[PDB]
Design a protein around this ligand. Structure first.
Ligand SMILES: CNc1nc2cc3c(=O)[nH]c(N)nc3cc2[nH]1
Ligand SMILES: CNc1nc2cc3c(=O)[nH]c(N)nc3cc2[nH]1
Ligand SMILES: [Zn+2]
Ligand SMILES: [Zn+2]
Lengths: 371, 371
């Protein structure tokens, strides 16, 4: 039987790595992309379809689920996996980002955050870890504070310091719950905004506590790719090399490629799902907007090489019609293709690292995607 | 290879019949229920899922498709079957009902109908048959006038007489188009409102022209079940016994059972799809509204006996959550279950007629469904 958690690196190229995380509910191939399933569903897909595209793990959210249908309710119904019909690993964010993003009123303190639902609710490190336990998450995220961008050095520091205190509280809450400690994994989240010294302090604090994996927090919050990449350049090497590195909320295909070049192993974002429903399809020649009139009579599949079931069977012209009509099948087909594209991107990344030709792959990918 | 059209009756019980229609694109088991696919999609289902529920044939609409994406456009793209990915028979309504139902302004004449889209457009018997040819419909409906309910005898008569003139025009248009005449079938539509003498005149006119099948038009337009059944009692026996009888727009499960008792072989309605998206699930114990709070923690499947993939895998509690959240997967799961339920109803009807126990089935079905 598989262990609670084991990360193994099979191949490297520069700072890039490829390997596997073994957990009780399954193996995760890295670098990994996690489709987002915020309301206990990956929007417009059955879990079997999510799996058929190649996903090994999906992301859920402490924030949305604690509000609807409720964490205790999900536990009473047998946990998130049983509830939504996904039997493989699930990573859950801790709520700290979403509360500050989506809540109408918030009160922040050293204890945690109180907020008004988009009734009043509270989140603290202890309550966050508890909710993630009630959901039955396999990868639990520490409860942190995502520092807004831009931040002054003093505010970035104060924020990061609070997040490190909360990281220790998260660790202790997780370890106190024997069933959770034995069956799930806990990741810490590095903060520090764009400042190298604060990123270093945060990495040191997280490593002293000790986690199963380390996320780079506080990015993909408006800073732009050049700045994100600059911060990754110095931040990722600060993290323990032998554990996974997770870049929260990233991202566009080129962001993923560059982040892997910088040592990131795990990704999530709503882009393929959300923009799929809005008419944007990913292709190896760059994104297209299927709503455009130029596709009304185009018999080609969304992408000429894609192996997904959508590209096997339906034309751009048909999907154009569905999305213009507001048909649910349009959302379904666009989302399945985009998630499949993301998984094919991760497979090409993994295979190119394993073969020592990832640098070449990145160059070829960009030349074509941005032609 | 299969013929253009052959209807064979395998078993009878009273006025009820069970059998098959063989067409080039497939066999249709009767009595048959046709899921409705008005915008070139059965809402929220891939065609493989429509087939997996047991459907042999689906319904499309001259009216919606001629407006979006356009009949000529669909023909240029290879026809409706290729466009939407359904390779089995498709029946198309002729537009005469939908124009009067959905258009904002209409001008009616002996030539046809001109209307404003929900730009100006025209429909006539000739143009309707042509559009159904461009779509590549397998069962083409004559272009008729659906008499509003209630109608006075004089207006019902005038309307029915016009429909019979249009039925002959429909026949001639269809026969003039060699490819259509050789590969598709043409059904006539009986009119006459609730009046026995007008129903008889219309049946006689349609039989004199000669059609592959006969629809009972002008019902399911507000008259209620008692009156519908009373009109079917005398109207269906007027139609040729050796051809299929199609009751347009029916209906609720009990309406289907009673209509089969009265000699109907074919059905369509938006109820399972549309009401599925709205939260109504069909069960052998009657419909339920999955939005109701009583289902928030109910671990049972939608229906306790249903063999569909939704009932194999997900709880009422989960689907309740999805529909309350407005999630697309909720529409998907509710629609698949309801279409599957309708197909299971038709299978039970067919098997009970084949075994000479349809009367008993109808009685048992009602006792439980209305308990
Ligand atoms: C879409 N962009 C994005 N940046 C993020 C940062 C964090 C972060 O710093 N902390 C936690 N807990 N979640 C996050 C989620 C993010 N999502
Ligand atoms: C939902 N109820 C319903 N009654 C109908 C009658 C006709 C009818 O008399 N003619 C044609 N062409 N379509 C029809 C579609 C119907 N749909
Ligand atoms: Zn594809
Ligand atoms: Zn079912």
């Amino acid at each position: 039987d598989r262990p609670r958690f084991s990360f193994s690196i099979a191949a490297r190229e520069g700072k890039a790595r490829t390997g596997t995380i073994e957990m009780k509910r399954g193996v995760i191939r890295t670098p990994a992309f996690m489709p987002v399933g915020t309301a206990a569903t990956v929007k417009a897909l059955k879990p079997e379809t999510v799996r058929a595209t190649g996903a090994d793990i999906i992301l859920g959210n402490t924030y949305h689920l604690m509000l609807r249908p409720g964490a205790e309710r999900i536990a009473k119904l047998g946990g998130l996996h049983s509830f939504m019909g996904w039997d493989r690993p699930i990573l859950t964010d801790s709520g700290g980002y979403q509360v500050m993003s989506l809540s109408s009123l918030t009160k922040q303190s050293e204890e945690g955050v109180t907020f008004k639902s988009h009734s009043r609710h509270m989140l603290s490190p202890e309550r966050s870890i508890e909710i993630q336990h009630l959901l039955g998450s396999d990868i639990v995220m520490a409860f942190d504070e995502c520092t807004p961008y831009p931040a002054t050095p003093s505010r970035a520091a104060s924020s990061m310091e609070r997040s490190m205190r909360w990281a220790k509280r998260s660790r202790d809450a997780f370890d106190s719950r024997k069933e959770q400690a034995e069956n799930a994994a806990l990741f810490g989240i590095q903060q520090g905004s764009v400042f190298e010294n604060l990123r270093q302090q945060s990495a040191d604090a997280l490593a002293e506590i000790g986690f199963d994996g380390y996320a780079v927090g506080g990015l993909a919050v408006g800073e732009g790719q050049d700045e994100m990449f600059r911060v990754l350049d110095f931040s990722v090497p600060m993290l323990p090399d032998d554990k996974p590195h997770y870049l929260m909320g990233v991202g566009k295909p080129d962001d993923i490629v560059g982040a892997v070049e910088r040592g990131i192993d795990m990704f999530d974002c709503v882009l393929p799902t959300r923009s799929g429903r809005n008419g944007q399809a990913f292709t190896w020649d760059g994104p297209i907007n299927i709503r455009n009139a130029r596709f009304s009579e185009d018999l080609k599949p969304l992408d000429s090489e894609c192996h997904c079931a959508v590209c096997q069977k339906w034309s751009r012209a048909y999907i154009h019609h569905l999305i213009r009509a507001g048909e649910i099948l349009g959302a379904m087909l666009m989302t399945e293709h985009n998630i499949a594209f993301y998984q094919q991107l991760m497979q090409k990344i993994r295979d190119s690292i394993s073969e020592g030709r990832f640098s070449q792959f990145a160059q070829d990918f960009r030349a074509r995607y941005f032609a």
